[PDB]
Amino acid sequence: AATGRIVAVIGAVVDVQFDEGLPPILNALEVQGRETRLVLEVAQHLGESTVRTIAMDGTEGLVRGQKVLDSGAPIKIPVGPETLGRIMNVIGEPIDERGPIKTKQFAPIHAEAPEFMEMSVEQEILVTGIKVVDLLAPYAKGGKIGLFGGAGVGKTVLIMELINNVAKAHGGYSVFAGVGERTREGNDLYHEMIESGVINLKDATSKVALVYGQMNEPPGARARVALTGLTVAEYFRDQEGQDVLLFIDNIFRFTQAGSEVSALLGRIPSAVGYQPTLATDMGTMQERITTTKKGSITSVQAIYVPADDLTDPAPATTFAHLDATTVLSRAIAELGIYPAVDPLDSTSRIMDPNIVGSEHYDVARGVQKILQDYKSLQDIIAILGMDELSEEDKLTVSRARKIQRFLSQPFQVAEVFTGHMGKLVPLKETIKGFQQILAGEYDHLPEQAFYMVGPIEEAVAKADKLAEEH
Template sequence: MSIKAEEISALIKQQLESYKDEISVEETGTVTYVGDGVARAHGLNNALQGELLLFDNGVYGMVQNLESSDVGIVVLGDFTGITEGDSVKRTGRIMEVPVGDQLIGRVVNPLGRPIDGKGDISTDKTRPIEHKAPGVMERQGVSEPLQTGIKAIDALVPIGRGQRELIIGDRKTGKSSIAIDTIINQKGQNMICIYVAIGQKASTVRAQVSTLEKFGAMDYTIVVTASPSEPAPMLYVAPYAGAAMGEEFMHNGKHVLIVYDDLTKQADAYRELSLILRRAPGREAYPGDIFYTHSRLLERAAKLSDELGGGSMTALPVIETKAGDVSAYIPTNVISITDGQIFLNSDSFYSGIRPAMDAGTSVSRVGGDAQIKAMKKVAGTLRLDLSAYRELESFAQFGSDLDAATKARLDRGARTVEVLKQGLHESVPVAKEVIILFALTHGHLDKLEIEDVLRYQNELFDYMDASHQDLEDTITKTGNLPEGDSLETAIAEFDATFQPTAKADNTAADTAD
């Protein structure tokens, strides 16, 4: 039997027509070291910084160090299933996380995987966790207020959309509470919130999520959490993952509030990684690029120009100090990157002044640009009044003879401190903040006893809701004080009905003694 040349030719043509170019060449390496969330691999000569790698057990890693003979890899997950000699291959992709509306209301880990037991998240959108911050010409000035619902902050250190305002203080001084209350106050404000919990106990995060659910805030919030039990790379990656999720909304013209709670623990995780990767330690054993680690993260918060949609991302990083030392390495770094700081004083906190904000140390570099006009008018002298009160208070305790003017300033200062006190999760709408501060600065509280101040405030709010809702609506809609003396008149009407607490008469008791 002979085979004709034409048949061979036809058969070859048929094979060529059905041929598909599916040959793939994968670059693989061999693990030479693994431990504490870090691996080293040999043979990945073309690996890129930040590239995703896949280990034999299905766990991903990210290239962190590029060296002459091997690469340093941070393992994004359980590293206990990886052993020396395992193979690891390049994926050709950089580290990315799922983004989009589907994540709202969910609790996820830094890889964007749900950990709240509510099923999978169906989104096909992803964004790289590392992204270049918007340039100078892509931004616009911060001018739109972000209302926290906390009187002391909105009056003294206002925050604007697109700003970066640091919350700093010792452990257990109410830093997270301020962040959570700010998120709760965004209800109905057209704001998407992202709460990044870095190195916080799972029970603490569960309590925060329960609080957000109770106040209906999870309807517009994403929680990203990396607990202390997870490897250091997860704590390091968490804030970048949260920033990527926020950027998706910002670049679509929406407004985002992101809380990094807290960056001290992220810096510690990065220090741990760097030391295991044998990077040269610097001050306090942190690596030389620790400043860049935080600056490239916080610079991603911005108010975009109108040409780019006008979206914004406001960052509230949290830093924990030790014994109020703001001159330590990480606090000074982050203070220099942000647009102001809210400093919480442990002495004030334990003396019952909550939020325990130190008006002298706290500052907003955006200032009045982030306040409505009405707030600017009523809060203009508050900072000076408080500073003068603190100074006079320290002198007044050494002597009893005070002139009338000094006594008046001390009395006004004491009432200012009392007005700025606020309970946990008791957000105050901006119109009501303006009303009570107007009453304070116009002397309506001067004759009250200190213990009557908060009762006066609450009863005034109820009276305005019942009898002068139009004045509140005017402040809310226009951002200005009502025309004429209508607000002054309304508060004077309430003053006539307010019943001060009767003082106990101790005369009889004194006589009996």
Template sequence: GNELYSNLRRLKMLDKVALYFGQMDKMPGARSRVGFSAVTAARYLRDYLKKDVVVFIDNIFRYVLAGMELATGLNKVPSELGYQPTLEKELSDLEEMMNSNENGSITSFQAVYVPADDFTDPSVVAVMPHLDSVVILSRQEAAKGNYPALDILSSTSSILTPEIVGERHYSVALKVKTYFQKYKELQHMIAILGVDELPFESRIIARRTERLRRFLTQPFFTAEDFAGQKGTYVPLEKTLDGCEKILDGKFDDVGLEELYMKGEI
């Protein structure tokens, strides 16, 4: 946590943040309770100081792991893959504390470690129903240099509805995901024939999807020190405009590198 503390101090944010640590060298009992301590503090800020609070949890799997170690120490009969039999209840106890009421809101961002990249792992399955939106990071996208390395097809959001985000946003997002799904179905043919040998309609889908993926890269402010590139803020409207232009074929003749890490077009 020393680097995190130093960065917060450099950014003059320490007066807006409370840090709670449950380090891996500590006893599992302490690690299993630190999340509740942090959320209790968030609830105090919400209910008594009338604040809207953001809770960052890195990593929720460590909470699960602490519970598993406690269960083993207490000789409880394990469930599937050695997890504690009370896994879902323990996660619910913590997750359900983070909510909104008439005093304010608690919004939580949680990093979820996926053991062996297995999304059917009981710990992952138990966490997912509590999350309104899930952003899945992909090793394959990272290997291609597409940052943020999102798995666009697997990432989901329960608030992506016309009533919440608006008809235009919903329509563009749906069309983009449709293109990515069709592109995924073409992968086998592309690997054998190459994009240029595909039927005309399939070739259009492949080229526009490749341009969409490059366009959806963005330099992050938080990565400036590592990437050596200044971060870019991209308004939602600019993102929608760019996606619509690519989907309409206005960038069919533009090279992929022309769209890479531009933020907006």
């Protein structure tokens, strides 16, 4: 096809001048004369038969005038069941040293979002075994979830506990896309999925496909790897009808990489410093991760929050794309409460009495009401002390602290930190325990009897142990 010449190299932004046969936007171009395959994705047409492109790998060693070849199609990755148990990078090459991925078809990573007449409405609660999640913000089968959190508050531990519970109990070809995360964590996940039998290195019956572009990758790879994993999941949903799980961690890195290349594309910076096209990029990417009438994609996404802002344009823009947000807090994690989910900031769309039932709904609303009352009291509690509160106020503070402690839970993936064995509290135990703590059936137990327990039976047992030993 068409051949052109590099005319400018600035970071990950390469300008390529074609003499004839200009390539459409979003096409893939192969730089000629390199040891490893370097792919440039067309982003703009500058005129003068020049295009501007974003490089999917490093641009060092590139010389002005180097040959570039046009592929005639966007980045195409192999899609199919043969991707299960394999690791592939942003451009579909296997990075697990197990040979080529011999699939029958390749899909472009740029596609159109499903139409409005394909949207599905069904809303069925997805039980995760986590107390605060299943009580205050239940997830939904086939709904986008999203886990917001600052730096080091429990995003990856929570996403791995969700992986364990849901993905292991599942039967529908999970997919994991590591976007701008630690390569160490990717190796850990690969090997803990090899040992658990979810990835089968021989006699291939795997049920998870991994796609990884990590912190070490240039901005173009970190900006398109989410689309690559998204494409794998879209294949599993549409052309098989399967019920896919899709885990994305971390998806703020997509916006951040767009912001890193936006300056070099010559665009006036928006607010904060992000690209002017933040919301529409997030929309074109996030509207493809969706359940249709053809298949179901349960999408859990970790979302980094820069400097613990939550009003930074990237988290603020992500909020509108999710059905059940779970917001972790640093102030809570400094109290020792894990998972550090903020009870008064995590929402859900199925938190509706006509879906979860009046029992669940009323218990959740009461828990949130008592926690809100405690928060509003906290200021004069810490100024004057509790000795000045009303007796009803002392009761609301007591029950609120107890509910705080009961919301925490030891995680199976956190035995290395908690020392306790991981508990998986089913839904009715959660509802009943919290209903009882609300009613006042435990006004005599010490508050530390609820910290890091399973169901309320373990709380009463821990209280008995504390009372007898001490």
